Every structure is written in C-alpha cells, then in structure tokens.
Design a binder for this molecule. Structure first.
Ligand code: HEM
Ligand code: HEM
Ligand code: HEM
Ligand code: HEM
Lengths: 140, 145, 145, 140
C-alpha cells in the first residue's frame, strides 16, 4: 500500500463511518447469494435476510477490517490470530477471500457515490487483497 | 441458468444503463485496478494516471464495443457460446489474454453497476448479474477449453 | 483437443501407471500441500502428519476411485462432459467444492507422474497431460457453468 | 515458511546443486509448451528446444530463486528489483506466476526421486508461492 492508497482507504473508512457493521453484513449476504459455495462454511447459521447471526458476524468482519486499516503497516501482526483461525480451524479455501473481497467492494460501491472513484476502487482492492494475503498466510 | 426472477433482475436494470458510458467506465477501471491489463492496450496512448485512463477517448470507444457484446449476451442467455465464438477465437487464439481477466472485467462491471444504481443494486440483483458475467467469461474462454 | 501425438503421449504413459497407487498418492499430496481440502475428508480419521495422510487406508482407497474416473476420462477425450456429469452434480451441487481445487488436484497428479516417470515425463508429455487434466477439471465444473 | 520448510527447501536446493540453471530452462520450456499464453511475454525469444535464449533465461530465473532461498527471511527486500520489473515493465499477469511455479515443481519432481516427498513438495510449493507473492506485490 502506497501513501495515496492509505489516504484513499481512510477516506472510504471515514465516509462509511458507523455504518461499517451493517455494510459488513450486507457484503456477507451478497457473497452467500452470489457464490453459494461459500455458504457451507456457515452450516449452523441461518443465512436468511435479516438474520441476527449474519448481522452479528458482519460487525465482527467490519471490526477486523478496521483493525487492519488502523494498523496498516503491521497487518500480519494485527491479523495473526484471525489468520490462524481461518486456515487452521475453518479451513477456508483461499479462493473464497477473493469472493468476499469483491462483495465488500460492491457493497462500498453501492453506498459511496462520491468516494468510489477509480483510484479509490484500486486502493480498496489492494487493501482487501493485502488483508486476504495475511488471512491465507497460515496453511500448514 | 437464470431463473425468471434472475432474468427480471437483469433486464429491468440493463434497460436503464447508459451504453455509451458504462463500458468505458468498466474498461478504464480494469486498466487502473488491474494494471497488467494495460499490456494489451499499448496503442491507446495516455494511460499514465487514472484521470488519463478514464478520460482517454480510445478507452471510452473500446469500452463501448465491449459493452455491446455484453448486451448481445444478455439477449441470448441460453446460447452464450455461439454468441461469443468469434470473440473467443480473438481473445484466446489471437490475443492470448488469460481468461482470469474475463472474470475480473465481469466483476469490475458489477462494481460499476453497484456504483451507478446504489441501493437498487440489491444482493439478489447482484447475484443474477454474477451468473451473467460468469457465463460470458466462460463463453469467451471456450477456445481455451 | 488432443492431437494424435498428444494422445500418444498420454496413453503410452498411462499404460504404465500403477492404478492402485497413483490416485492415493495424488489425493494424499493434495491434502498435505493444500490443507484446506481436508475440510471434505473429516470422516477419514488420522490426517495429522504427512506420513499419517499418505499411509491412511481411506486416502488410498478413495484415491483409487478418483483415479478410476481420470482413467474413464482418458478413454473418452471427446466427451468429457457426459463422462463427468454425475460427478459434476456430486462435486458442485452436493459437495460445493470450489472448482479451483479440481485444477489443483490435476496439477498434483501431474507432479506425481513427473516424480514416478522422471525424464520420461518430458515437456511435451507434460503439455499433453495438462490438456487432459484441464479438460477433466472443466468437465467436473460443468454444473457451476 | 516454517523452520521445517526452510530445511526442506534447502535439501532440495542442495540436491539440485549445479543443475539449477539447466532445470530453470527446462521449467520455462515446460511452461511455454503447457501454457502457450505465457509465450507472448517472450516475443523476441526463440522458444524452440535448445534455444540459447531460454538456456540463458533459465539461469537467471534459477539465480533469482537461489537468492530468495539464501535470504528467505528477507525475500521482499531480496526480490524488490525483480518485483518492480515484473509488475511495472513486463506487466506479468499474476496468474502466470502460478503457472511457472507449477512447472518449477514438476521439473524438481522429474529430477528428485528421493527428495520430492509429500512434505518437501509442500515446502517447495510454499516457497514458490512466497516468491510469487513478492513478485506480484508491486502493481500500481
Ligand atoms: C475480508 C476477509 C475476512 C475477514 C476480515 C474475516 C473476519 C472474521 C472474523 C473477525 C471472525 C470472527 C472470529 C471469532 O470472533 O474468533 C471470522 C470468523 C469466520 N469466518 Fe471470516 N473473515 C474473512 C473472510 C472469510 C471467508 C472468505 C470465509 C468463508 C467463505 C470466512 C469464514 C468464517 C467463518 C465460518 C467464521 C466462523 C463463524 C462463526 O462460527 O460464528 N471468513 N471471520
Ligand atoms: C470478458 C469480457 C470481454 C468482452 C465481452 C470483450 C469484448 C471485445 C470486443 C467486442 C472486441 C472488439 C472486437 C472487434 O473490433 O471486432 C474486443 C477487442 C479486444 N479485446 Fe476484449 N473483451 C473482453 C475482455 C477483454 C480483456 C479482459 C482484455 C485484455 C485485458 C481484452 C482485450 C482486447 C483487445 C486488445 C482487443 C482488440 C483486438 C484488435 O482490435 O486487434 N478484452 N473485446
Ligand atoms: C478434479 C478431479 C476429481 C475427481 C475425478 C474426483 C472423482 C471422485 C469420485 C470418482 C468420487 C466417488 C464417488 C462415488 O463413490 O460414487 C469422489 C467422491 C468425493 N470427492 Fe472427488 N474428485 C475430484 C476432486 C475432488 C476434490 C478436489 C475434492 C475436495 C477437495 C473432492 C472431494 C470428494 C468427496 C468429499 C467425495 C465423497 C463424496 C461422498 O461419498 O459422499 N473431490 N470424487
Ligand atoms: C518464479 C518466478 C519468477 C522468477 C524468479 C523470475 C525471474 C526473472 C529474472 C531474474 C529476470 C531477469 C531480470 C533482468 O536480468 O533484469 C526475469 C525477466 C523476465 N521474466 Fe521473470 N521471473 C519469474 C516469473 C515470470 C513469469 C511468470 C513471467 C511470464 C510468464 C516472466 C517473464 C519475464 C520476462 C518476459 C522477462 C524479461 C526477459 C528478457 O527480455 O530477456 N517471469 N525474470
């Protein structure tokens, strides 16, 4: 991430503001509907629209992404526990991070009229790719 | 495999798309977000900044052609393979574009639709569009299969 | 699309393959090298170490079935889609395996063939096998298309 | 890369010994034949069997991989110039690093009877994936 990328991700973060957890839940719903293979990681969830479990999980995902942006030059350390979880316990296929990341970008596009410029799109793509790189760094 | 509701989602939104603009927007964002794709567009001149890419008249013109083919696929959802046959020969046998980039351009188009339609681009509408752009990408990749 | 020389490369090597062993070797290496794939094999018991994976009798037995399907595709190179139809329903509609893993298992099989045949596994022979495993992976993914 | 992975990659490196440049050229040939889309990055090469240009290039690729293994805990720094080259100048599609890496593994398999065990295969896959991650870290 370049300085401009950090600037752009911060612009997006600040505009999203306190909607981040709601948008996380929307991104998860977008992923489950668009990429139904991802649903099998959530068998004990009810994934229907308005599910309290998807709402709760989207807040967790958003909080992790905000932690990563708040520590953007130390993301391997910040996301270390979550990288362990996703690889060792959950066995998330690396492909699936590309699917969630796309759905997070679409959600931001759908809520950020002014901010989702081509440059800010590129910066958010790189940020989510960097988060995904850390979260797939622990298979063993 | 679109259901009738999926088909409704897609065609009702596409009727509202500005076909002179959206293809240039998606092609420009492909070149900005996935810069290796600029390798195929050397003749297009200034691609040095995102503003230069998005304002480049050849990017806009070429994107208009690209979207025209998407529109042709939306009109032939049960025969994408024949619809995309000459374009598959072009992109696979002549240009050798890796077909992962067909998937990326489809997802960029989805982002552009989300940005232009906002809340109207609901999670079900997106899912229907994901089936369409995956079908177009697989049809365009037929000559690699 | 195999040429006759490609077809010759493939069938002359496959005649020499130990069909009781090579599928277990490839499945075991998939589970060791791409450990997320262990998610689908919870019932198989000890997968805790590479020796435990490679020596697990259920890995060997299951791999024998997997290779049996590859062998059926090698015998039907012009109709892989019908050959793999029920397996495509199984892997896509029932198991929801991401089809990238079909590509990975094919490439693991290529590595196993390279390791067993050494110099006989020449760059042209590998290229012919890459066309076969890509065709098998695309056929198995048909129900996602 | 775990300590065992570093051990395993070192075992493989030492067995390959002074054949590394020859094996690099073989891996490139395997890639061009198996994945003909990769050929268009080498229009000014003759890619025929026995080409002095492929032989020379395979020695360069092997030398870069040996530099990365010799500096395995500092690979982003060691490969920085090459990461710049591949992204900025050559515009190598990220997919293509997966293709070359597979061909490098097949080449090693074809020449390392004893050493290409399942564990060492996994370690070499992780090493080549780590090299590829650095070489695709500079798109801008
Ligand atoms: C942007 C990438 C991602 C982020 C930041 C993220 C973050 C999180 C967080 C914070 C947790 C909760 C950890 C618990 O509170 O210890 C979690 C759990 C989990 N994640 Fe992810 N995740 C990501 C991608 C994925 C992907 C791609 C999948 C699968 C398609 C996935 C599947 C799961 C599952 C199944 C759980 C456990 C859920 C539960 O049982 O309640 N994650 N993730
Ligand atoms: C996946 C969706 C795609 C569609 C529907 C599409 C469609 C088209 C169309 C309609 C043409 C004009 C062909 C003519 O003038 O008759 C074109 C040409 C071309 N496309 Fe695409 N394309 C796609 C993806 C891509 C991507 C991902 C790349 C490169 C990254 C690419 C690079 C090219 C090039 C370089 C030309 C010019 C060919 C020439 O005039 O010599 N295309 N494409
Ligand atoms: C790409 C090449 C593949 C082939 C040719 C193949 C072939 C087979 C065959 C022949 C069957 C036995 C089906 C029956 O008993 O009738 C099987 C079952 C199964 N396969 Fe695969 N497979 C492939 C890839 C994979 C991969 C990549 C995964 C997971 C990572 C997977 C997981 C499964 C599972 C979990 C079963 C058991 C299904 C059950 O008994 O309920 N397969 N496969
Ligand atoms: C294991 C991954 C790779 C390694 C270690 C590597 C290494 C190298 C090295 C050392 C050079 C020479 C740099 C000059 O001496 O400044 C080079 C050049 C180049 N590489 Fe790679 N490379 C890798 C993957 C790829 C891939 C995947 C492609 C394309 C499919 C590619 C395409 C090129 C090209 C076209 C050149 C310039 C060649 C010349 O014009 O003579 N490289 N690479």
């Amino acid at each position: 991430l370049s300085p401009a990328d950090k600037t752009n991700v911060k612009a997006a973060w600040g505009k999203v503001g306190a909607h981040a957890g709601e948008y996380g839940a929307e991104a998860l719903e977008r992923m489950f509907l668009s990429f139904p293979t991802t649903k099998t990681y959530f068998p004990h969830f009810d994934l229907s629209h308005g599910s309290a479990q998807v709402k709760g999980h989207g807040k967790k995902v958003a909080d992790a992404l905000t932690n990563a942006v708040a520590h953007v030059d130390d993301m391997p350390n910040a996301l270390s526990a979550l990288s362990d979880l996703h690889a060792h316990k959950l066995r998330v296929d690396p492909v699936n991070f590309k699917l969630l990341s796309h759905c997070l970008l679409v959600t931001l596009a759908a809520h950020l009229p002014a901010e989702f410029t081509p440059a800010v799109h590129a910066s958010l793509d790189k940020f989510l790719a960097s988060v995904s790189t850390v979260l797939t760094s622990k298979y063993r | 495999h679109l259901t009738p509701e999926e088909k409704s989602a897609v065609t009702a939104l596409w009727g509202k798309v500005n076909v002179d603009e959206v293809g240039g927007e998606a092609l420009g964002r492909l070149l900005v977000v996935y810069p290796w794709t600029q390798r195929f567009f050397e003749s297009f001149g200034d691609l040095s900044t995102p503003d230069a890419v998005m304002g480049n008249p050849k990017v806009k013109a070429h994107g208009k052609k690209v979207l025209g083919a998407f529109s042709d696929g939306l009109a032939h959802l049960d025969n994408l393979k024949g619809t995309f046959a000459t374009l598959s020969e072009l992109h696979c046998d002549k240009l050798h574009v890796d077909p992962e980039n067909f998937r990326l351009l489809g997802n960029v188009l989805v982002c552009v639709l989300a940005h232009h339609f906002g809340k109207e681009f609901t999670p079900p509408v997106q899912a229907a569009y994901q089936k369409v752009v995956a079908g177009v990408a697989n049809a365009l990749a037929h000559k690699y299969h």
